[PDB]
């Protein structure tokens, strides 16, 4: 299955960015539609990515660690 | 069906935002894939949702009322 | 098949934009789900199209000609 969603590094932390090509390249690379960086959301300035497959972890409610 | 739209209420009107995660809130609720707050858009400060089934309603051409 | 890319025109070149609903009117008239225009993205400010079917071009890495 795939979601839309903040690609997630260990444990449980967004990706910081600048540029949607940045975020389109990483989010591609992991298998998703494309990405962009997303500036002033819920968790700052973030990656976001368009069907992720799931055997990619995600962003979820809790600490990043 | 699914389609990308702005989620529509009673009767053909947008909801109006000012927060990605109001818009992804309000769409992801209603089955969309993702959601976002377009600015300066074609119905002002706007909910766009990605993948909206089309079992809710959509905001068409014509009047709010 | 379907990919998110930038819509192409003769030959391997964006379309620039100012407005969202400009891309979104171009990207699903040629069958994507929906566009908007990016701006001070990789091409400047040019059309991002989800899911365009694979019949119509897209920009690939080279020159606008
Ligand atoms: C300023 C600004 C801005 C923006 C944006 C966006 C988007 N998509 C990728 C959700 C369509
Ligand atoms: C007003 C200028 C907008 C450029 C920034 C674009 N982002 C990187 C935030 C894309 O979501
Ligand atoms: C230039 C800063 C951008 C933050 C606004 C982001 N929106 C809420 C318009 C996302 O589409
Ligand atoms: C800060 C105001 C944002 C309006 C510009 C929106 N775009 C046309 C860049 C949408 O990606
Ligand atoms: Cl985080
Ligand atoms: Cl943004
Ligand atoms: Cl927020
Ligand atoms: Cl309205
Ligand atoms: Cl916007
Ligand atoms: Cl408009
Ligand atoms: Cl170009
Ligand atoms: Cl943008
Ligand atoms: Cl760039």
Same mark, same amino acid.
């Given at each position: 299955?795939?979601?839309?969603? *903040? ?14 090509? *940045? ?5 591609? #690379? ?11 959301? #819920? *968790? ?5 990515? *368009? ?11 809790? #600490?990043?660690?």
């Amino acid at each position: 299955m795939v979601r839309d969603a *903040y690609i997630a590094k260990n444990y449980n932390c967004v990706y910081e960015c600048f540029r949607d090509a *940045y975020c389109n390249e990483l989010c591609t #690379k992991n298998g998703a539609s494309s990405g962009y960086c997303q500036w002033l959301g #819920k *968790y700052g300035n973030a990656c976001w990515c *368009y069907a992720l497959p799931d055997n990619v972890p995600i962003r979820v409610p809790g #600490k990043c660690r």
